[PDB]
């Protein structure tokens, strides 16, 4: 799993979560050409704990191409957690401690805010078709809904 972290202050934050390639419709995020990039952030302010958001929507659903380089950045921008992205073919309803095994592609779990800063990761995917979930394995969290589904076709 990616267990490499860097830290970024707000501004930084807010830079990033821009470069989220994907277009949005309804709970759906739709993704297209050769090599796409994903945004993900863990419980933005104002949003529902705990959650993902991405493209400024919570939980939506991702439609990625099959055959795209998936270039995933991830950034924990809750105090007090350290949420984790994990990529998994296991479907929900998820247990408190979630068997998701094998992670086809992921995150360990990200370091908490930390002296006006917060950590985060990238990491690369190629996908084969088929349907995924992302997921966060603190205990209990996936169980109460922080999760989304992922279609590759
Ligand atoms: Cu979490």
């Known amino acids: 799993l990616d267990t490499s972290w860097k830290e970024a202050t707000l501004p930084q934050v ?9 277009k949005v419709s309804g709970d759906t995020v739709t993704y ?6 994903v945004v993900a952030a863990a419980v933005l302010p104002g949003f529902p704990f705990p959650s993902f958001e991405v493209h400024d929507k919570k939980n939506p659903t991702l439609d990625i ?9 991830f950034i924990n921008t ?9 990529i998994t073919q296991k479907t929900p309803p998820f ?14 779990f990200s370091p908490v805010p930390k002296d ?34 992922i279609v590759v076709k």
Request: with cysteine; charged share 10%; hydrophobic share 35%.
């Open 32 to 37: 297209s050409g050769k090599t796409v990039h």
């Open 65 to 73: 191409p099959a055959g795209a380089t998936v270039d995933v950045t």
């Open 116 to 149: 006006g800063k917060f950590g985060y990761t990238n990491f690369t995917w190629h996908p084969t078709a088929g349907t995924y979930y992302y997921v966060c394995q603190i205990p209990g969290h996936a169980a109460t809904g922080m999760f989304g589904k």
């Open 14 to 22: 807010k830079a990033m979560l821009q470069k989220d390639t994907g």
């Open 95 to 108: 247990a408190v401690m979630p068997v998701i095994d094998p992670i086809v592609a992921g995150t360990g």
């Open 78 to 86: 809750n105090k007090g957690f350290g949420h984790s992205f994990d």
